[PDB]
Amino acid sequence: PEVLRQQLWLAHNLREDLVSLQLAYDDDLKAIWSSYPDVAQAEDTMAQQLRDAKKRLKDARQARRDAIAVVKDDAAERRKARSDQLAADQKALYGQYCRDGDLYWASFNTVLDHHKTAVKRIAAQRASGKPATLRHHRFDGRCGSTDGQPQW
Amino acid sequence: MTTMTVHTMGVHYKWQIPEVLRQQLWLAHNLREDLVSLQLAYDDDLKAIWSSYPDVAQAEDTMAAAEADAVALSERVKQARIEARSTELTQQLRDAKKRLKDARQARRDAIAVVKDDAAERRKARSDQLAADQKALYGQYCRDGDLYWASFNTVLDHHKTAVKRIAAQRASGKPATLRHHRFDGSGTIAVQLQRQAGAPPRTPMVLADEAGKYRNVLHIPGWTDPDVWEQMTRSQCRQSGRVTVRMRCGSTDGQPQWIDLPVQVHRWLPADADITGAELVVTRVAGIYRAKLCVTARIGDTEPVTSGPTVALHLGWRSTEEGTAVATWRSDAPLDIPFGLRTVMRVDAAGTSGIIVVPATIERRLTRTENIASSRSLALDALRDKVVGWLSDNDAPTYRDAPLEAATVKQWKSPQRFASLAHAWKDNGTEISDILWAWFSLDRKQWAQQENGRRKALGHRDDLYRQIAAVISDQAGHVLVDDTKIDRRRDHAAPGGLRASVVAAMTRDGVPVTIVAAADFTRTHSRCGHVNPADDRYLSNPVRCDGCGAMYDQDRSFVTLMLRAATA
RNA sequence: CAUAGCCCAGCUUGGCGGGCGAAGGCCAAGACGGAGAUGAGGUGCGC
Ligand SMILES: [Mg+2]
Ligand SMILES: [Zn+2]
């Protein structure tokens, strides 16, 4: 049914918005970290002959992580504020997708868990030195509401 | 017009596999497995009938006793090795081996002498085998969903395999058929029926959308190869992206077709006569690669008359820049393409050369082996970690059944771990992350651990095939010998070079001559003296008994091959 | 997730541009009979 197709389309749309919000939140954290002059200097520094470069690159990579740890406490409020900002924006998507949309709330809840599950895996994965991330997945194709009319 | 040719066409990787094709491969697997089981049953019946003869019974009892003595002496030798932690006992074991071989010869003789008596029994069993196969066909086709062409292809593969195994058992290794697990990789086929007094199934007939085979196989957009060789590679590879309609099979008594995206690189000559088309599905590192093969009949080529005689010789002696896999000599100077001059070396006169394989093949295969070892160690680490977690925690149901540490401890193949991981994608358990963190990583490695190998091996094959071409370009006659250390020989593998050279010479019509290489290496070309010692040749060069000067054994080999040819 | 390999219209080799389980392909030289990884015995599927 077209209702089924539209719900999936809304489901695909919601994930992109959540992915879009995450990277901006991810970028905001990067901007928050880059505020410290020590962090910025390391990032510029970060920016047989193979081994020497690799060693210096990771040392620069480690130093940037080292600078993150020392000033982690002093930036906790700033990180939380953007974290609170992300939650509010994520809350706003519920109104647009569910309160003002025909998407089923169970579908939103399920995807929200999946993204939140995904970021937890991702966040620790990048920590030790093993990088990977969310990227935009292209759309490929009770049953919620329909102009406020529930359909089955 | 007798020669058969087979042309390959690749399938698009962004092509899925329909449900009908999976059903066909599943049925083909089941047929092959029942056939293997019946083959083993038939072999067991034959062995029992052989054993029925009291002389054969006595010979078999003697053989069993000799085998028991041999294994007992092997156990004693193993115990002596363990106690020494690393000659008379070995001599006793050798005596037991000799006795076992003598008993085996006696058993073979006993079978041979009474062979004419159980011929009726053997024929009756074979007839029952044929009847069982016919019943299988009646089930799979007359009452099943298999297409009769695929059944014929599987039967032909099976009967080829049984002859291979019988030859191996006659020629040594007591190998046998082994059941296999349905990984999802198989073979399907379609035949082209041409009754008597019928027009040739021309490739142009196939491209017709209203042809006599529009319901069986249809490859639109054929081109004459004479025009084809002038089209640029651009329009060539853009023109070949075509859509093959193929009869695939029936489901609930309804024919089903598939529409493969294929990229055709060479077309068939207009006078050809197609025979059949077989679709092969291969699995490598969890990627379904497919390939369509078309077989036809083509007129032969006139054999050449002019062209220097070229002699080839094989080895596996090493060289600093790669394995030195062959040495060739020519009657007259030869021309070697510039793109191969670093693989097919040539001398000053142009009549002699060395074929080496660049060492990059060896390095890549070594990388594959090291990735295999590292994968094994990481596999063990994951096994230990999952066992520990299972011991210390609850077990969420897998396949709706509790998981036990003993069963997990007995796993050796990655397959069980993979299925469990895909089962626990999102259980939320930490082990699941531990069970996914491994998984993804290895499939990156698994790809490499396989693909590189094939890719690397492909490269080597290419060189050999290319070499074949150049010789058939000039040679009026080609001669071949009838001939870590083993690993290097498994990497270079001159057997491939011999097979490719013979195949190319057959296709091009050049005469191939198998020289009797008997008493050649011990023979020096210049001094004409044989050398009885069989250990001096392990190094190069070797001193000559009849002349007292070191010489190239391979160069003398090719010189002798040419001399014997030039008689 | 290792630090260079693998993949992105048959195959191998080069070159341009991309992807790390997903994407995105383009160009050039050459060659080409499909039918061999002991890892399994599941009685449909390493998604
Ligand atoms: Mg290709
Ligand atoms: Zn001599």
Side-chain angles (χ1 to χ4, degrees), chain B residues 280-323:
Chain B
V280 195
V281 189
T282 54
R283 266 183 38 90
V284 162
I287 303 181
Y288 280 83
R289 291 170 31 87
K291 166 184 55 155
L292 180 99
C293 303
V294 160
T295 306
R297 211 166 304 142
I298 282 196
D300 313 339
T301 318
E302 298 190 17
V304 302
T305 55
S306 293
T309 302
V310 184
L312 210 84
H313 181 51
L314 291 183
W316 78 100
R317 316 194 70 85
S318 180
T319 303
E320 314 90 76
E321 302 167 350
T323 302

mmCIF file of all heavy atoms in Angstrom, chain B residues 280-323:
data_model
loop_
_atom_site.group_PDB
_atom_site.id
_atom_site.type_symbol
_atom_site.label_atom_id
_atom_site.label_comp_id
_atom_site.label_asym_id
_atom_site.label_seq_id
_atom_site.Cartn_x
_atom_site.Cartn_y
_atom_site.Cartn_z
ATOM 1 N N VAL B 280 27.470 -20.384 -14.595
ATOM 2 C CA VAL B 280 28.254 -20.820 -13.450
ATOM 3 C C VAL B 280 28.206 -19.733 -12.392
ATOM 4 O O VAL B 280 28.492 -18.565 -12.686
ATOM 5 C CB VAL B 280 29.705 -21.106 -13.856
ATOM 6 C CG1 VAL B 280 30.401 -21.878 -12.777
ATOM 7 C CG2 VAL B 280 29.722 -21.876 -15.146
ATOM 8 N N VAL B 281 27.854 -20.110 -11.163
ATOM 9 C CA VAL B 281 27.800 -19.180 -10.042
ATOM 10 C C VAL B 281 28.889 -19.568 -9.055
ATOM 11 O O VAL B 281 28.884 -20.687 -8.530
ATOM 12 C CB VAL B 281 26.420 -19.190 -9.368
ATOM 13 C CG1 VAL B 281 26.339 -18.083 -8.371
ATOM 14 C CG2 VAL B 281 25.331 -19.039 -10.387
ATOM 15 N N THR B 282 29.817 -18.649 -8.801
ATOM 16 C CA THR B 282 30.917 -18.875 -7.875
ATOM 17 C C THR B 282 30.783 -17.932 -6.693
ATOM 18 O O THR B 282 30.378 -16.778 -6.841
ATOM 19 C CB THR B 282 32.287 -18.652 -8.535
ATOM 20 O OG1 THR B 282 32.325 -17.354 -9.137
ATOM 21 C CG2 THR B 282 32.548 -19.684 -9.593
ATOM 22 N N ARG B 283 31.125 -18.428 -5.510
ATOM 23 C CA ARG B 283 31.179 -17.608 -4.309
ATOM 24 C C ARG B 283 32.626 -17.425 -3.894
ATOM 25 O O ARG B 283 33.338 -18.406 -3.662
ATOM 26 C CB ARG B 283 30.397 -18.231 -3.161
ATOM 27 C CG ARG B 283 28.974 -17.752 -3.041
ATOM 28 C CD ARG B 283 28.323 -18.387 -1.831
ATOM 29 N NE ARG B 283 29.255 -18.491 -0.716
ATOM 30 C CZ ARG B 283 29.421 -17.561 0.211
ATOM 31 N NH1 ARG B 283 28.711 -16.446 0.206
ATOM 32 N NH2 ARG B 283 30.322 -17.755 1.167
ATOM 33 N N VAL B 284 33.056 -16.174 -3.794
ATOM 34 C CA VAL B 284 34.383 -15.838 -3.304
ATOM 35 C C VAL B 284 34.213 -14.738 -2.268
ATOM 36 O O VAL B 284 33.703 -13.658 -2.585
ATOM 37 C CB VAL B 284 35.319 -15.393 -4.428
ATOM 38 C CG1 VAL B 284 36.489 -14.654 -3.853
ATOM 39 C CG2 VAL B 284 35.795 -16.587 -5.206
ATOM 40 N N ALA B 285 34.626 -15.015 -1.033
ATOM 41 C CA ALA B 285 34.586 -14.046 0.062
ATOM 42 C C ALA B 285 33.194 -13.451 0.238
ATOM 43 O O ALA B 285 33.030 -12.261 0.498
ATOM 44 C CB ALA B 285 35.620 -12.944 -0.137
ATOM 45 N N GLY B 286 32.177 -14.293 0.101
ATOM 46 C CA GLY B 286 30.821 -13.811 0.284
ATOM 47 C C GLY B 286 30.307 -12.887 -0.795
ATOM 48 O O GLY B 286 29.416 -12.078 -0.529
ATOM 49 N N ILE B 287 30.841 -12.972 -2.007
ATOM 50 C CA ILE B 287 30.351 -12.194 -3.136
ATOM 51 C C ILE B 287 29.954 -13.171 -4.232
ATOM 52 O O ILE B 287 30.763 -14.010 -4.647
ATOM 53 C CB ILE B 287 31.394 -11.196 -3.643
ATOM 54 C CG1 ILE B 287 31.820 -10.260 -2.520
ATOM 55 C CG2 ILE B 287 30.833 -10.390 -4.784
ATOM 56 C CD1 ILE B 287 32.831 -9.221 -2.964
ATOM 57 N N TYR B 288 28.720 -13.060 -4.707
ATOM 58 C CA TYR B 288 28.227 -13.945 -5.755
ATOM 59 C C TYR B 288 28.672 -13.424 -7.114
ATOM 60 O O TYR B 288 28.052 -12.516 -7.673
ATOM 61 C CB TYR B 288 26.710 -14.035 -5.693
ATOM 62 C CG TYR B 288 26.192 -14.970 -4.642
ATOM 63 C CD1 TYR B 288 26.073 -14.557 -3.328
ATOM 64 C CD2 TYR B 288 25.813 -16.261 -4.959
ATOM 65 C CE1 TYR B 288 25.595 -15.400 -2.356
ATOM 66 C CE2 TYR B 288 25.331 -17.116 -3.994
ATOM 67 C CZ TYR B 288 25.225 -16.679 -2.694
ATOM 68 O OH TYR B 288 24.744 -17.528 -1.724
ATOM 69 N N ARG B 289 29.735 -14.000 -7.656
ATOM 70 C CA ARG B 289 30.143 -13.741 -9.026
ATOM 71 C C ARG B 289 29.539 -14.793 -9.939
ATOM 72 O O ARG B 289 29.560 -15.987 -9.634
ATOM 73 C CB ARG B 289 31.663 -13.763 -9.178
ATOM 74 C CG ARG B 289 32.396 -12.628 -8.509
ATOM 75 C CD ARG B 289 33.888 -12.890 -8.520
ATOM 76 N NE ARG B 289 34.275 -13.669 -9.688
ATOM 77 C CZ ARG B 289 34.575 -13.154 -10.871
ATOM 78 N NH1 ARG B 289 34.524 -11.851 -11.092
ATOM 79 N NH2 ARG B 289 34.924 -13.969 -11.863
ATOM 80 N N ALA B 290 29.018 -14.346 -11.070
ATOM 81 C CA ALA B 290 28.417 -15.245 -12.038
ATOM 82 C C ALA B 290 29.183 -15.134 -13.344
ATOM 83 O O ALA B 290 29.991 -14.223 -13.528
ATOM 84 C CB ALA B 290 26.934 -14.934 -12.254
ATOM 85 N N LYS B 291 28.947 -16.088 -14.236
ATOM 86 C CA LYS B 291 29.626 -16.084 -15.523
ATOM 87 C C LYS B 291 28.870 -16.987 -16.481
ATOM 88 O O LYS B 291 28.489 -18.098 -16.106
ATOM 89 C CB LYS B 291 31.073 -16.543 -15.356
ATOM 90 C CG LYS B 291 31.775 -16.892 -16.633
ATOM 91 C CD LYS B 291 33.165 -17.416 -16.335
ATOM 92 C CE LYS B 291 33.120 -18.577 -15.365
ATOM 93 N NZ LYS B 291 34.308 -19.458 -15.515
ATOM 94 N N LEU B 292 28.641 -16.520 -17.703
ATOM 95 C CA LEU B 292 27.908 -17.290 -18.698
ATOM 96 C C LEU B 292 28.904 -17.804 -19.724
ATOM 97 O O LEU B 292 29.731 -17.037 -20.219
ATOM 98 C CB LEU B 292 26.843 -16.430 -19.368
ATOM 99 C CG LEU B 292 25.992 -17.098 -20.432
ATOM 100 C CD1 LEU B 292 24.685 -17.496 -19.821
ATOM 101 C CD2 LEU B 292 25.761 -16.175 -21.591
ATOM 102 N N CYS B 293 28.855 -19.094 -20.034
ATOM 103 C CA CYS B 293 29.752 -19.669 -21.024
ATOM 104 C C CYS B 293 28.931 -20.244 -22.166
ATOM 105 O O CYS B 293 27.982 -21.000 -21.932
ATOM 106 C CB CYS B 293 30.643 -20.736 -20.397
ATOM 107 S SG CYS B 293 31.609 -20.142 -19.007
ATOM 108 N N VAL B 294 29.296 -19.888 -23.395
ATOM 109 C CA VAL B 294 28.617 -20.363 -24.595
ATOM 110 C C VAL B 294 29.587 -21.247 -25.360
ATOM 111 O O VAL B 294 30.741 -20.863 -25.572
ATOM 112 C CB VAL B 294 28.131 -19.194 -25.467
ATOM 113 C CG1 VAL B 294 27.878 -19.650 -26.877
ATOM 114 C CG2 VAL B 294 26.877 -18.602 -24.894
ATOM 115 N N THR B 295 29.133 -22.434 -25.757
ATOM 116 C CA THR B 295 29.969 -23.390 -26.470
ATOM 117 C C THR B 295 29.411 -23.639 -27.863
ATOM 118 O O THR B 295 28.203 -23.815 -28.034
ATOM 119 C CB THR B 295 30.060 -24.707 -25.708
ATOM 120 O OG1 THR B 295 30.494 -24.455 -24.370
ATOM 121 C CG2 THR B 295 31.046 -25.632 -26.377
ATOM 122 N N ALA B 296 30.296 -23.672 -28.851
ATOM 123 C CA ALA B 296 29.898 -23.833 -30.238
ATOM 124 C C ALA B 296 30.943 -24.633 -30.998
ATOM 125 O O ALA B 296 31.976 -25.021 -30.447
ATOM 126 C CB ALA B 296 29.701 -22.485 -30.910
ATOM 127 N N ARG B 297 30.665 -24.865 -32.274
ATOM 128 C CA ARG B 297 31.538 -25.626 -33.157
ATOM 129 C C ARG B 297 32.075 -24.696 -34.233
ATOM 130 O O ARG B 297 31.335 -23.862 -34.761
ATOM 131 C CB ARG B 297 30.777 -26.790 -33.779
ATOM 132 C CG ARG B 297 31.609 -28.006 -34.080
ATOM 133 C CD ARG B 297 30.686 -29.168 -34.351
ATOM 134 N NE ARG B 297 29.782 -29.370 -33.228
ATOM 135 C CZ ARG B 297 28.510 -29.718 -33.349
ATOM 136 N NH1 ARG B 297 27.955 -29.901 -34.535
ATOM 137 N NH2 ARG B 297 27.774 -29.878 -32.253
ATOM 138 N N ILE B 298 33.355 -24.824 -34.550
ATOM 139 C CA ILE B 298 34.018 -23.919 -35.478
ATOM 140 C C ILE B 298 34.889 -24.728 -36.428
ATOM 141 O O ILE B 298 35.455 -25.756 -36.040
ATOM 142 C CB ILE B 298 34.844 -22.865 -34.712
ATOM 143 C CG1 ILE B 298 33.918 -21.788 -34.159
ATOM 144 C CG2 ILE B 298 35.900 -22.230 -35.593
ATOM 145 C CD1 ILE B 298 34.642 -20.538 -33.732
ATOM 146 N N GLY B 299 34.978 -24.275 -37.678
ATOM 147 C CA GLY B 299 35.863 -24.923 -38.627
ATOM 148 C C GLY B 299 37.316 -24.850 -38.197
ATOM 149 O O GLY B 299 37.769 -23.869 -37.609
ATOM 150 N N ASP B 300 38.058 -25.907 -38.515
ATOM 151 C CA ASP B 300 39.447 -26.006 -38.099
ATOM 152 C C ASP B 300 40.330 -25.065 -38.906
ATOM 153 O O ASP B 300 39.906 -24.445 -39.884
ATOM 154 C CB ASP B 300 39.955 -27.436 -38.253
ATOM 155 C CG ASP B 300 38.991 -28.454 -37.698
ATOM 156 O OD1 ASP B 300 38.148 -28.081 -36.854
ATOM 157 O OD2 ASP B 300 39.076 -29.631 -38.107
ATOM 158 N N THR B 301 41.580 -24.964 -38.475
ATOM 159 C CA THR B 301 42.583 -24.157 -39.148
ATOM 160 C C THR B 301 43.538 -25.062 -39.913
ATOM 161 O O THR B 301 43.833 -26.178 -39.476
ATOM 162 C CB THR B 301 43.361 -23.311 -38.138
ATOM 163 O OG1 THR B 301 42.454 -22.773 -37.169
ATOM 164 C CG2 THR B 301 44.074 -22.166 -38.837
ATOM 165 N N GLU B 302 44.007 -24.589 -41.058
ATOM 166 C CA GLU B 302 45.012 -25.336 -41.799
ATOM 167 C C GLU B 302 46.302 -25.389 -40.991
ATOM 168 O O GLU B 302 46.795 -24.343 -40.558
ATOM 169 C CB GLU B 302 45.283 -24.696 -43.154
ATOM 170 C CG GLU B 302 44.092 -24.644 -44.083
ATOM 171 C CD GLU B 302 44.489 -24.226 -45.485
ATOM 172 O OE1 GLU B 302 45.695 -24.284 -45.801
ATOM 173 O OE2 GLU B 302 43.599 -23.839 -46.270
ATOM 174 N N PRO B 303 46.867 -26.567 -40.761
ATOM 175 C CA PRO B 303 48.132 -26.643 -40.024
ATOM 176 C C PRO B 303 49.254 -25.944 -40.774
ATOM 177 O O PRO B 303 49.303 -25.938 -42.006
ATOM 178 C CB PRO B 303 48.386 -28.150 -39.910
ATOM 179 C CG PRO B 303 47.603 -28.751 -41.024
ATOM 180 C CD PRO B 303 46.390 -27.891 -41.190
ATOM 181 N N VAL B 304 50.165 -25.345 -40.007
ATOM 182 C CA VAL B 304 51.240 -24.562 -40.600
ATOM 183 C C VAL B 304 52.253 -25.490 -41.260
ATOM 184 O O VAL B 304 52.314 -26.691 -40.989
ATOM 185 C CB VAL B 304 51.916 -23.660 -39.555
ATOM 186 C CG1 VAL B 304 50.900 -22.724 -38.924
ATOM 187 C CG2 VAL B 304 52.609 -24.502 -38.506
ATOM 188 N N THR B 305 53.063 -24.914 -42.144
ATOM 189 C CA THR B 305 54.084 -25.684 -42.841
ATOM 190 C C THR B 305 55.464 -25.093 -42.594
ATOM 191 O O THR B 305 56.441 -25.829 -42.433
ATOM 192 C CB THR B 305 53.796 -25.722 -44.340
ATOM 193 O OG1 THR B 305 53.660 -24.384 -44.832
ATOM 194 C CG2 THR B 305 52.514 -26.488 -44.610
ATOM 195 N N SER B 306 55.549 -23.768 -42.554
ATOM 196 C CA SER B 306 56.810 -23.078 -42.345
ATOM 197 C C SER B 306 56.811 -22.445 -40.965
ATOM 198 O O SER B 306 55.787 -21.949 -40.488
ATOM 199 C CB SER B 306 57.055 -22.005 -43.409
ATOM 200 O OG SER B 306 57.251 -22.592 -44.683
ATOM 201 N N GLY B 307 57.975 -22.469 -40.329
ATOM 202 C CA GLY B 307 58.128 -21.960 -38.991
ATOM 203 C C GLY B 307 59.138 -22.778 -38.222
ATOM 204 O O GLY B 307 59.104 -24.012 -38.227
ATOM 205 N N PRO B 308 60.054 -22.106 -37.538
ATOM 206 C CA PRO B 308 61.147 -22.819 -36.875
ATOM 207 C C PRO B 308 60.631 -23.732 -35.779
ATOM 208 O O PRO B 308 59.581 -23.492 -35.180
ATOM 209 C CB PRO B 308 62.015 -21.695 -36.298
ATOM 210 C CG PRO B 308 61.554 -20.443 -36.979
ATOM 211 C CD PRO B 308 60.127 -20.653 -37.334
ATOM 212 N N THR B 309 61.376 -24.805 -35.537
ATOM 213 C CA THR B 309 61.049 -25.739 -34.473
ATOM 214 C C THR B 309 61.477 -25.145 -33.141
ATOM 215 O O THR B 309 62.601 -24.655 -33.003
ATOM 216 C CB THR B 309 61.729 -27.087 -34.698
ATOM 217 O OG1 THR B 309 61.328 -27.612 -35.967
ATOM 218 C CG2 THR B 309 61.329 -28.064 -33.616
ATOM 219 N N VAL B 310 60.571 -25.176 -32.171
ATOM 220 C CA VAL B 310 60.789 -24.582 -30.860
ATOM 221 C C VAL B 310 60.662 -25.671 -29.810
ATOM 222 O O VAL B 310 59.658 -26.392 -29.773
ATOM 223 C CB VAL B 310 59.796 -23.440 -30.595
ATOM 224 C CG1 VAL B 310 60.107 -22.777 -29.290
ATOM 225 C CG2 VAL B 310 59.890 -22.429 -31.701
ATOM 226 N N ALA B 311 61.675 -25.789 -28.960
ATOM 227 C CA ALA B 311 61.714 -26.793 -27.910
ATOM 228 C C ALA B 311 61.699 -26.107 -26.554
ATOM 229 O O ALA B 311 62.339 -25.066 -26.372
ATOM 230 C CB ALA B 311 62.950 -27.677 -28.047
ATOM 231 N N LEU B 312 60.974 -26.694 -25.611
ATOM 232 C CA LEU B 312 60.761 -26.123 -24.292
ATOM 233 C C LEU B 312 61.147 -27.137 -23.229
ATOM 234 O O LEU B 312 61.051 -28.346 -23.454
ATOM 235 C CB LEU B 312 59.308 -25.721 -24.117
ATOM 236 C CG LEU B 312 59.049 -24.553 -23.188
ATOM 237 C CD1 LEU B 312 59.228 -23.271 -23.933
ATOM 238 C CD2 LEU B 312 57.641 -24.657 -22.683
ATOM 239 N N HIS B 313 61.597 -26.649 -22.076
ATOM 240 C CA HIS B 313 61.952 -27.523 -20.969
ATOM 241 C C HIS B 313 61.545 -26.880 -19.651
ATOM 242 O O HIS B 313 61.574 -25.652 -19.518
ATOM 243 C CB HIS B 313 63.442 -27.823 -20.970
ATOM 244 C CG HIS B 313 63.869 -28.731 -19.866
ATOM 245 N ND1 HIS B 313 63.251 -29.936 -19.619
ATOM 246 C CD2 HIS B 313 64.855 -28.616 -18.945
ATOM 247 C CE1 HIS B 313 63.836 -30.525 -18.593
ATOM 248 N NE2 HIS B 313 64.813 -29.745 -18.166
ATOM 249 N N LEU B 314 61.206 -27.719 -18.674
ATOM 250 C CA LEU B 314 60.601 -27.287 -17.423
ATOM 251 C C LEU B 314 61.514 -27.582 -16.239
ATOM 252 O O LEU B 314 62.372 -28.466 -16.307
ATOM 253 C CB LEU B 314 59.256 -27.978 -17.220
ATOM 254 C CG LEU B 314 58.194 -27.499 -18.196
ATOM 255 C CD1 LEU B 314 56.871 -28.163 -17.913
ATOM 256 C CD2 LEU B 314 58.072 -26.006 -18.108
ATOM 257 N N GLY B 315 61.326 -26.824 -15.157
ATOM 258 C CA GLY B 315 62.071 -26.966 -13.918
ATOM 259 C C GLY B 315 61.395 -26.158 -12.831
ATOM 260 O O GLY B 315 60.233 -25.767 -12.954
ATOM 261 N N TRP B 316 62.122 -25.947 -11.732
ATOM 262 C CA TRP B 316 61.737 -24.922 -10.767
ATOM 263 C C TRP B 316 62.951 -24.349 -10.041
ATOM 264 O O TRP B 316 62.860 -23.953 -8.878
ATOM 265 C CB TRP B 316 60.681 -25.438 -9.783
ATOM 266 C CG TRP B 316 61.141 -26.326 -8.650
ATOM 267 C CD1 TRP B 316 61.364 -25.946 -7.358
ATOM 268 C CD2 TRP B 316 61.346 -27.749 -8.686
ATOM 269 N NE1 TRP B 316 61.735 -27.028 -6.602
ATOM 270 C CE2 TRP B 316 61.729 -28.148 -7.390
ATOM 271 C CE3 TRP B 316 61.262 -28.718 -9.691
ATOM 272 C CZ2 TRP B 316 62.027 -29.471 -7.074
ATOM 273 C CZ3 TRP B 316 61.558 -30.033 -9.371
ATOM 274 C CH2 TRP B 316 61.935 -30.396 -8.074
ATOM 275 N N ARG B 317 64.088 -24.275 -10.730
ATOM 276 C CA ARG B 317 65.276 -23.655 -10.159
ATOM 277 C C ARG B 317 65.039 -22.167 -9.926
ATOM 278 O O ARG B 317 64.295 -21.511 -10.658
ATOM 279 C CB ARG B 317 66.476 -23.850 -11.079
ATOM 280 C CG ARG B 317 66.596 -25.250 -11.635
ATOM 281 C CD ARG B 317 67.960 -25.472 -12.246
ATOM 282 N NE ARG B 317 68.982 -25.526 -11.211
ATOM 283 C CZ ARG B 317 69.301 -26.622 -10.539
ATOM 284 N NH1 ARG B 317 68.695 -27.774 -10.770
ATOM 285 N NH2 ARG B 317 70.238 -26.556 -9.598
ATOM 286 N N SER B 318 65.689 -21.633 -8.899
ATOM 287 C CA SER B 318 65.412 -20.277 -8.454
ATOM 288 C C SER B 318 66.338 -19.259 -9.121
ATOM 289 O O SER B 318 67.416 -19.581 -9.622
ATOM 290 C CB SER B 318 65.534 -20.181 -6.935
ATOM 291 O OG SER B 318 65.255 -18.864 -6.495
ATOM 292 N N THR B 319 65.887 -18.006 -9.114
ATOM 293 C CA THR B 319 66.651 -16.875 -9.619
ATOM 294 C C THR B 319 66.309 -15.669 -8.759
ATOM 295 O O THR B 319 65.201 -15.557 -8.233
ATOM 296 C CB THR B 319 66.346 -16.604 -11.097
ATOM 297 O OG1 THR B 319 66.627 -17.781 -11.861
ATOM 298 C CG2 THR B 319 67.180 -15.452 -11.638
ATOM 299 N N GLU B 320 67.276 -14.758 -8.630
ATOM 300 C CA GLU B 320 67.133 -13.625 -7.723
ATOM 301 C C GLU B 320 65.936 -12.748 -8.057
ATOM 302 O O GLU B 320 65.453 -12.021 -7.182
ATOM 303 C CB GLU B 320 68.409 -12.787 -7.741
ATOM 304 C CG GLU B 320 69.674 -13.617 -7.647
ATOM 305 C CD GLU B 320 70.204 -14.021 -9.007
ATOM 306 O OE1 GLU B 320 70.793 -13.166 -9.699
ATOM 307 O OE2 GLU B 320 70.020 -15.197 -9.384
ATOM 308 N N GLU B 321 65.443 -12.795 -9.292
ATOM 309 C CA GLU B 321 64.351 -11.937 -9.727
ATOM 310 C C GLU B 321 63.043 -12.702 -9.889
ATOM 311 O O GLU B 321 62.077 -12.170 -10.444
ATOM 312 C CB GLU B 321 64.744 -11.245 -11.029
ATOM 313 C CG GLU B 321 66.017 -10.434 -10.892
ATOM 314 C CD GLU B 321 66.577 -9.999 -12.226
ATOM 315 O OE1 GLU B 321 66.079 -10.479 -13.264
ATOM 316 O OE2 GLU B 321 67.523 -9.187 -12.235
ATOM 317 N N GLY B 322 62.993 -13.933 -9.408
ATOM 318 C CA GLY B 322 61.825 -14.778 -9.540
ATOM 319 C C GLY B 322 62.203 -16.218 -9.828
ATOM 320 O O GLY B 322 63.363 -16.564 -10.039
ATOM 321 N N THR B 323 61.179 -17.061 -9.824
ATOM 322 C CA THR B 323 61.381 -18.478 -10.084
ATOM 323 C C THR B 323 61.633 -18.699 -11.569
ATOM 324 O O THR B 323 60.862 -18.237 -12.413
ATOM 325 C CB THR B 323 60.159 -19.269 -9.628
ATOM 326 O OG1 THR B 323 59.930 -19.030 -8.237
ATOM 327 C CG2 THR B 323 60.385 -20.748 -9.831
#
